[PDB]
Nucleic acid binder design. Structure first.
Length: 274
RNA sequence: UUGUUGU
């Protein structure tokens, strides 16, 4: 058994509700280049943007099925070099909507292709990667909504709930029921495993930081954060002080921090390096 | 509209 440094959060915001700064269901969280916190407020049909200190900035998306209208947004990603926000809509829309940094509509696509989007992210070539649970599929789009890659992996995925990529076309997916992160390439080849049972049980998300370290997040008792090299060599392991409710999503921030979206309708900002 | 686990 491995020894974990203790970690605590230094910021916390949000509460149940329907007004600014309030959440019905904070299903997805993403961080942009100025470390704003973008939240998918699913049952409120809106995306909410805060600064790195939980301060509400603005919001966009009203109920509906046409342009400039979100129904059930569950996950978000950010195009870092543009500020654009990538939104995935749950059933019955099952599609992707792209908004700019100002919350204005750009385009939407993928409704005839997506079914169960459970994680989304963007690579350095601007390509959008989506992972789907229940059916176990990875689909990769360009910014214009053209499908570039599609592959199933029901043989290798039990419960995919998060995704990031590096600069080498490798895809890192957290598998909640495999208790690890599984690595694939864009062609669908199953490369390797990072983490495992006993060290990263029931992961709830995965991240990659500026050092190119793979962070696996779980909530199997405390809120645990296990940090690996891209090979799977263990670097660092941490556990929180508090115990949390169910957790939706995690997102990394510039200065060695993680945003943790909880069932208790509050986002918690942990720091994993002093 | 919604597959985490921690009875």
């Amino acid at each position: 058994q491995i020894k974990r440094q203790k970690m605590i959060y230094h910021c916390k915001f949000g509460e149940f509700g329907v007004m600014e700064g309030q959440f019905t269901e904070p299903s997805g969280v993403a961080v942009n280049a100025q470390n704003d916190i973008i939240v998918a407020d699913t049952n409120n049909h809106r995306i909410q943007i805060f600064d790195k200190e939980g301060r509400f900035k603005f919001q966009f998306g009203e109920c509906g099925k046409r342009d400039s209208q979100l129904l059930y947004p569950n996950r978000v990603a950010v195009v870092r070099n543009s500020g654009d926000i990538i939104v995935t809509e749950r059933s019955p829309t099952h599609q992707i909507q792209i908004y700019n940094q100002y919350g204005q509509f750009v385009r939407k696509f993928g409704a005839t292709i997506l079914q169960h989007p459970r994680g989304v992210t963007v690579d350095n070539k601007g390509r959008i990667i989506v992972v789907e649970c229940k059916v176990m599929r990875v689909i990769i789009f360009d910014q214009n909504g053209n499908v570039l890659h599609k592959f199933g992996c029901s043989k290798h995925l039990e419960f995919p709930n998060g995704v990031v990529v590096n600069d080498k076309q490798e895809i890192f997916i957290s598998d909640n029921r495999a208790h690890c992160v599984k690595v694939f390439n864009y062609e669908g080849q199953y490369l390797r495993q990072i983490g495992g049972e006993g060290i990263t049980n029931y992961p709830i998300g995965v991240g990659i930081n500026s050092n190119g370290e793979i962070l696996i997040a779980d909530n199997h008792n405390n809120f645990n954060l296990t940090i690996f090299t891209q090979d799977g060599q263990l670097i660092s392991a941490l556990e929180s002080k508090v115990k949390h409710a169910q957790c939706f999503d995690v997102a990394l921030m510039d200065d060695g921090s993680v945003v943790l979206a909880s069932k208790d309708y509050r986002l918690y900002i942990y720091r994993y390096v002093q």
